[PDB]
Design a binder for this molecule. Sequence first.
Ligand SMILES: Nc1ncnc2[nH]cnc12
Ligand SMILES: Nc1ncnc2[nH]cnc12
Lengths: 229, 229
Amino acid sequence: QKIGILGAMREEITPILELFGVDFEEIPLGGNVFHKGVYHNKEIIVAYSKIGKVHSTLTTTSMILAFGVQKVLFSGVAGSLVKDLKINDLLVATQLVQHDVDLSAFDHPLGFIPESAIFIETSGSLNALAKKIANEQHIALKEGVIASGDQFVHSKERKEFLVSEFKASAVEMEGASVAFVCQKFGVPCCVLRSISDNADEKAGMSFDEFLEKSAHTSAKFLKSMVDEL
Amino acid sequence: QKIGILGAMREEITPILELFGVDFEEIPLGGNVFHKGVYHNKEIIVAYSKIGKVHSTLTTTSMILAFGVQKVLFSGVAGSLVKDLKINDLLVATQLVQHDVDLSAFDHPLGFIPESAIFIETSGSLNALAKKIANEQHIALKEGVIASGDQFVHSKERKEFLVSEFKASAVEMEGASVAFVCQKFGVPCCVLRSISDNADEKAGMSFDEFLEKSAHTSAKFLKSMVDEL
Ligand SMILES: Nc1ncnc2[nH]cnc12
Ligand SMILES: Nc1ncnc2[nH]cnc12
């Protein structure tokens, strides 16, 4: 079995590497470093993509094409758009959208690109596994919509748009693109996020305070999933 | 020699296929169809990515990793931001930026992502070849900055931003991402565009009228470059 494990930032994968605690071979490709290891009879390939849609699309495509991963699990932090997602809370993305896509010049719905779709789906099986683990461990786990775009959201106005247009529960910058690539190649994908901020005027300061802890919370949960695979 | 040739839309590569006039093998991968042919001792791989940064990043990465292309030439249409770029006029991108990238929440310059750069460069050699061909054929060819983003621009306000923030000459939705992937893999890249509209309130109607002709103008020029490779 071969499992790809992705984060966007070094801070998001550092706890992943430490938690698995095995020897990793570092393999450079396409401006990324892939960490290849063996964990309980499974080959794991771990990398951070760097932030945003282009970075994450590239890295996910490399993972699939060059490393032959059979599933991709993403772990990282996100901004909350809903009251019931507090700092540190976990969410699994059931659907994702590229919230900054706009071809309204041609009267297309926002988020829509011709020959594509507004929403991208993730793995029913992996999401179901996540919910079972959360329940067993007495952890709250929201199953909902993630909006992804190439802006770090820090305004009430944009939050209101994401909630009204897309019914999004959280916002980040890589989930939709990772899930998109996985779907195009027929690779099961799960996107996990822990909340670092409220995507408002104070989002940057909140993110700075909570990045480490939220990154660890997500990583620890991802590890618990791999332990059941 | 192996050359990748990319457009974003079917309309942008149809004239490319027709102009080369050779037999193509159709090969599906990652939601794209790659057209593989032989033209004067060179293997050419032609595809359209579909619109936008995620689509084009995926396709370019597939071209490089799965097909082993040694250079990538992009051809398509774009919106003009400058008076001296009229409908049908050609531009080669010397530098490109992702104009919709915004991490100002952390006081980063617009267009900047940590561990990256605002501007992406293209092939000095290919751009120089393009200028020589244009000169020899009495064709105007601007060498300038392209701004790429996941919105089809159709407002004076956004045009003013692109010109002031990035000194952009044209706007489109794939150039920066294609060039970005090529640079990460050390693959020479040239991005060619023909103007279809003025990126203003009437951009959609202009695009509809001029897509076919502008797409052909770009394709014909791209072919003339390949004829010198
Ligand atoms: N507010 C926010 N916007 C985008 N990505 C984020 N990741 C964490 N917080 C975020
Ligand atoms: N106005 C515009 N905005 C973005 N991409 C374009 N391609 C052609 N015209 C465009």
